[PDB]
Amino acid sequence: MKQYLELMQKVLDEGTQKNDRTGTGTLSIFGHQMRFNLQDGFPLVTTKRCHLRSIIHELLWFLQGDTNIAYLHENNVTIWDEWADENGDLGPVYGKQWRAWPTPDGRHIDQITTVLNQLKNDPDSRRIIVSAWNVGELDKMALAPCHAFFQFYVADGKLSCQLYQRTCDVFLGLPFNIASYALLVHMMAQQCDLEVGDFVWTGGDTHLYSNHMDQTHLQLSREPRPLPKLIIKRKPESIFDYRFEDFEIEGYDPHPGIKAPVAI
Amino acid sequence: MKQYLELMQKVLDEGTQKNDRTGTGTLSIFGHQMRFNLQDGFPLVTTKRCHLRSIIHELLWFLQGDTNIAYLHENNVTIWDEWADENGDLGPVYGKQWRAWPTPDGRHIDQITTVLNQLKNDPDSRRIIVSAWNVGELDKMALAPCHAFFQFYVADGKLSCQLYQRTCDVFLGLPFNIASYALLVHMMAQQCDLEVGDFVWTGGDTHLYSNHMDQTHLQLSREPRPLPKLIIKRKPESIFDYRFEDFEIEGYDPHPGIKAPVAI
């Protein structure tokens, strides 16, 4: 997409050379923001073939709040295998914080229900927020939250959402990340009888790995195509009742997929 | 400053009309980002007279972690009086989370020391973060964090910082907000023997109150002047040992101050 390709080019033109968790070098910039008007189409990259299968399953999994990968495994979703232990546990990652943030007084805060409550009764609230950045539980998580915090906003009958992504592998992870949150906005909007607004993506350490340079140049040589349209076949009673089959994508005509090799 | 005035104009041109905590109407946009290269000068607005007295005291107060306004009062800083109770308490606001985030297992996490530890031993970390958004303690705070989360970044010997501001009164609060964080970056950089980089400001619900429109148009008619220079007269042994007198501003030549009337 235009916004995505412009970010790739920006990292290439302005990125500084360094390293990551000590391994593969990277070109990186700090601080970036882009906006996707969801009324213009579902933001699924077209300059390379992407699939929504894992994205959808992971999101439904997040919303359920169970951090064991059992559900993902039953559906052959393996993106979390790398971080899961023998029992399939990941510690209190995303879902646990979204649905049951533990407080010092023994309570479990349901941030998703809280946000829906706010969108329904106080849509102009300036604190319709979900945070996965639970400082007191970071050490127990298999992975510190990458999509760390997000906020909702309502205006002119439309729901918008801004995500703060602390770290981002532009080539491998970003396409997945944008589609995931765009899907969440559509689901939240449907439950609130609102139209979709903008998805605002804000990033911290935004980078391209050195071994993805040829792949990036290849993608940049391709012309973006019209964005597809997301179709929600059913209207569930609540945000926790969506099913994999409820989602469909129309008019998706991407360029060939590009593999993303990673070092270990 | 150029960046500040451009935001004012953007809210005027693109802002949507609505309301706040039910009271004064506002013009607002959602999602914005601007960057201040601290090497170009200290970002203290010049199109209206600003003072750093309260800003400095509040920051030193944050760093100490005590949320009682006693210190502020002793120095005639009254910006928190509005929210403090009879005893001068505010609940677990900013400072408490910065220095002693309570965990469910009975610990108090010092995020400031953690960040300094990271800048010293792992400057390329993609999670050098401080969060004040403690979901489990929001109800006990006199005010939910407005400057909610910030992240540091190091490149080419320079320290950068990005702040996520969930809500922002562009006319009254923003000038204060930018200077406060710019000061923190300078202090953090000095302690780490680094040069200052960029301060990246990211906002959520960014607005202008209806009763600040004339004031905004007046400020927009004024030409920004060269930014001043921050002078740190001393080099403390740690981030917790700064004193009010350690800071001085040179070359500050602003336009006259503009009062900001607020409804109650």
Residue with tokens 């929001």: B138
Of B109, B126, B131, the CB nearest to A133: B131
DSSP state of A1: -
- Residue (of B158, B152, B153) closest to B197 by Cα position: B158
Residues in chain A: 264
Q: Looking at beta carbons, which residues of chain B come within 8 Å of A162?
A: 30-31, 204
What's domain B2-264's superfamily in CATH? Thymidylate synthase/dCMP hydroxymethylase domain (3.30.572.10)
Give the helix/strand (H/E) hosting B168: strand B158-169
Query: Looking at CA atoms only, how far is residue B220 from chain A in angstroms?
Result: 25
Residues 16-45 (A) with a CB less than 8 A from some CB of B: 16, 18-20, 28, 30-33, 35
Q: Which chain B residue shows the shortest CA-CA distance from A109?
A: B136
Q: Which amino acid is at A186?
A: H
Experimental method: X-ray
Distances in Å between the alpha carbon of A15 and those of A7, A22, B171, B236?
A: 10, 18, 33, 33
Query: Please, where are the H alpha helices in A24-69?
Result: 53-64
Phi/psi region, residue B65 (left: phi>0; alpha: psi -120 to 50; beta: rest), is left
Q: Looking at beta carbons, which residues of chain B come within 8 Å of A149?
A: 131, 133, 148-149, 164
Task: Please state, in angstroms and rounded to a whole number, the distance separating the CA atoms of residues A42 and A189.
Answer: 14
Residue with tokens 């945000």: A239
Beta bridge pairs of residue B198? B37
Query: Please, where are the H alpha helices in B47-163?
Result: 53-64, 70-74, 94-100, 111-121
Task: Please give the interface size between A and B, counted as residue pairs whose CB atoms are below 8 Å apart.
Answer: 133
Query: Looking at CA atoms only, how far is residue A244 from chain B in angstroms?
Result: 30
This structure's resolution (angstroms)? 1.7
Task: Please state, in angstroms and rounded to a whole number, the distance separating the CA atoms of residues B87 and B81.
Answer: 11
Contact A151 B162 (CB under 8 A): no
Contact A164 B103 (CB under 8 A): no
Is A50 noted as a catalytic residue in this protein?
no
Asked if B238 has any chain A CB less than 8 Å from its own CB, the reply is: no
CA A187, chain centre distance (Å): 14
Phi/psi region, residue A24 (left: phi>0; alpha: psi -120 to 50; beta: rest), is beta
Of B31, B104, B153, the CB nearest to A33: B31
Which sign, positive or negative, has the C-alpha torsion A88, A89, A94, A100?
positive
